[PDB]
Structure formats: C-alpha cells, structure tokens
Design a protein around this nucleic acid. Structure first.
Lengths: 57, 57
DNA sequence: GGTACAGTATATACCATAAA
DNA sequence: TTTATGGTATATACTGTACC
C-alpha cells in the first residue's frame, strides 16, 4: 500500500521530532522508534522528514 | 537513464525560470520549451522545479 | 468522459561514512 | 568488505481542473 500522512500521524511525527529537539537534530530511526506505529517503515519517515525539514527551515 | 542536474543544465533551468518571471510564475512545460534540451522530459523539469521552488521561497 | 496539464505528496535511488 | 544508516537527489503517484 501507499502511506498517507493523515493529520494525526503527522501530529505524532511532529511531537516525536520535537522530543528529539527539532527537525535538524532528529533522525529517521529515532522518529520511527518514538512513534511505534504498526507497519510504518524507516523509509516512510525518512522521506517525510525530508519534506518537513524543507517546509520549516 | 536517471537524469543528473549538472551545474550547466541547472544554470539553463534557472535562466529559463527567470525569463518566465520567477519560480512561482514559471511552468514545467514553459521551462521545458525554453531549454530545448534533447531527451529532457516534462517530468524531469516538473520534479526539479518543485525542489527549486521550495529551496528558494 | 477522456486528455493534458499543474500542483503536490510520497517513494525510490544515489552517495558518503561509520562500524564491524 | 559488508551492513546500516543519514543525507540528498530524483522519480513516480496522486488530485484537481480546464478544455474539448
């Protein structure tokens, strides 16, 4: 299937990234392990963090 | 093949986008037709303009 | 009701580096 | 010399809309 970043999933992702101390500091694997979401791969998080990083700073 | 945005190709792409009056105004097809580069598809330009747009404004 | 396109989201491939 | 990872570049899929 193709992942959809629903506004909940994204809010999870953000809280995660904040805990990790901002988008720049945060790591894919780190975000992954904090979210603990069934079926979410590292590759899902990696791509999305890449966007999140650019649409921020 | 997989396209590589060599610093020349990119300089072409930019001049194009400028002629078209900035990244926001510019269109994939428009940039395409101004560059007139053998083997360059609209899909190449589309993706790259998407990046150019975010790493600018 | 089918193109052709723009805009956007997501995925995938590349490239370097560290650790073993 | 593999494996795992992060960063990054590029590609591919989705969604709407205008035109015909």
């Amino acid at each position: 299937a193709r992942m959809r970043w629903t506004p909940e999933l994204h809010e999870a992702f953000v809280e995660a990234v904040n805990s990790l101390g901002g988008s720049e500091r945060a790591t894919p694997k780190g975000v992954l392990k904090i979210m603990k979401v069934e079926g979410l791969t590292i590759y899902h998080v990696k791509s999305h963090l890449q966007k999140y990083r650019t649409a921020r700073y």
